[PDB]
């Protein structure tokens, strides 16, 4: 079933476009004029819709009757396949799970249980009473309000999309001499705050690495966040605990308004032979205690 | 329903840039189209060659 429906594209036929349709579509794609039909749907989107509804319309049961698969048959293939997984295989799996299932796992509700069982066409214990209960309760809202397909639809901060950060920026440069490319040069690219943009840079580096089929620098998150690293190390040594320091446990000292002046004139008057000296990753460290806190993790160093 | 209706409408229909008095439509102390003073100015003029 999986081979015929999902994997074989060549057997998939699409409704053929008329000549008028071909023209209107072309001229829509090449040059946009406002007020137009917002749909203009890519045959890519269409195709993927047909596939996902092929996953909708898949039902199990006796296959001497209509449907293709025994349930036992399905979980059998599933079991053979799950044992069959490599490292990056089950990595792809767990990513796929974190992206699709996991958020749904957070947004569920009793109101869905019937629908939740309609996926496998399994019959519940209480099915009539759940019919009644869920009918009465879904009565209290819009039908769009209650369907689990649409509950994830909006995401804050639409200016930077995860889809668009998949291609990492200027990867054809900082690949080739990663030392000449401190986090600053790239951080001018994003209109976000500090913690967020450094976070994003880490993700860029990792995506890039996995893309080029080489292993990523795991010391990179420690390098970009170095100040946060050392603050956490010294906090862990101070309050005795293992974890990451959170806000409640910060010192209650109140600095004066001008407290930063000394450091301000020290920074404003600094000077550097080259730009590498300006931002090297290790300028955070002076005493030996600094070097002992920064590398305590690698028993190599 | 009505309130967010109004919010969307007032936000989409708001003007921007500088007017004839050299200021924003939302500027603090100085105003434009007082008592439909421009509306009437179109009433009596009209647009024709």
């Amino acid at each position: 079933w999986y081979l015929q429906n999902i994997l074989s594209l060549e057997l998939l036929k699409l409704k053929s476009k008329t000549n008028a349709e071909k023209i209107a579509t072309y001229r829509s794609y090449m040059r946009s004029l406002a007020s137009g039909k917002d749909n203009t749907m890519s045959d890519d989107d269409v195709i993927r819709n047909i596939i996902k509804e092929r996953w909708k319309t898949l039902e199990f049961g006796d296959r001497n009757a209509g449907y293709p698969c025994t349930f036992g048959d399905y979980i059998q293939f599933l079991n053979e396949w799950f044992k069959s997984l490599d490292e990056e295989g089950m990595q792809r799996l767990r990513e796929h799970f974190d992206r699709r299932i996991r958020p749904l796992l957070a947004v569920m509700s009793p109101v869905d249980i019937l629908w939740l069982e309609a996926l496998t066409q399994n019959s519940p214990h209480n099915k009539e009473q759940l019919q009644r209960k869920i009918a009465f309760q879904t009565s209290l809202g819009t039908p769009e309000f209650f369907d689990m397909s649409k509950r994830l639809r909006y995401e804050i901060n639409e200016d930077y999309k995860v889809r668009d950060e998949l291609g990492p920026e200027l990867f054809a440069l900082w690949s080739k001499a990663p030392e000449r490319w401190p986090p600053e040069r790239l951080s001018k690219m994003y209109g976000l705050d500090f913690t967020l943009v450094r976070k994003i840079l880490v993700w860029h580096h990792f995506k890039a690495c996995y893309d080029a089929c080489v292993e990523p620098d795991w010391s990179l998150p420690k390098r970009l966040f170095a100040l946060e690293w050392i603050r956490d190390v010294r906090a862990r040594k101070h309050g005795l605990f293992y974890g990451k320091m959170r806000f409640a446990e910060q010192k209650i000292t109140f600095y004066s308004d001008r407290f930063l002046f000394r450091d301000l004139v020290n920074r404003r008057e600094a000077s550097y032979a080259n730009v590498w000296e300006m931002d090297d990753p290790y300028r955070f460290l002076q005493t030996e205690q600094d070097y002992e806190d920064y590398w305590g993790d690698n028993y190599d160093v | 329903m009505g309130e967010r209706m109004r919010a969307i409408i007032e936000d989409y229909s708001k003007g921007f840039g500088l007017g004839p008095h050299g200021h924003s439509p939302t500027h603090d102390t100085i105003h434009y189209n007082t008592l439909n003073a421009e509306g009437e100015r179109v009433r009596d003029l009209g647009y024709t060659d």
Binding site: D86, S175, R180, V214, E215, D217, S219, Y299, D300 | -
Partner: protein
């Protein structure tokens, strides 16, 4: 560059380069547990050029 890159990619996983791929699972590594320090990233171009 293409060869330095090729080699690094190959010693990352060999199973990417097989026509019929065998099972690819991570094993131990000879440099240490921190071996990534001596391994990672992409081949680097000479800085003069």
């Amino acid at each position: 560059y293409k060869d330095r890159l090729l080699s690094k990619q190959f010693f990352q996983n060999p199973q990417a380069f097989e026509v019929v791929p065998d099972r690819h699972e991570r094993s131990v590594q000879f440099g240490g547990k921190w071996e990534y320090q001596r391994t990672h990233g992409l081949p680097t171009v000479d800085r003069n050029e």
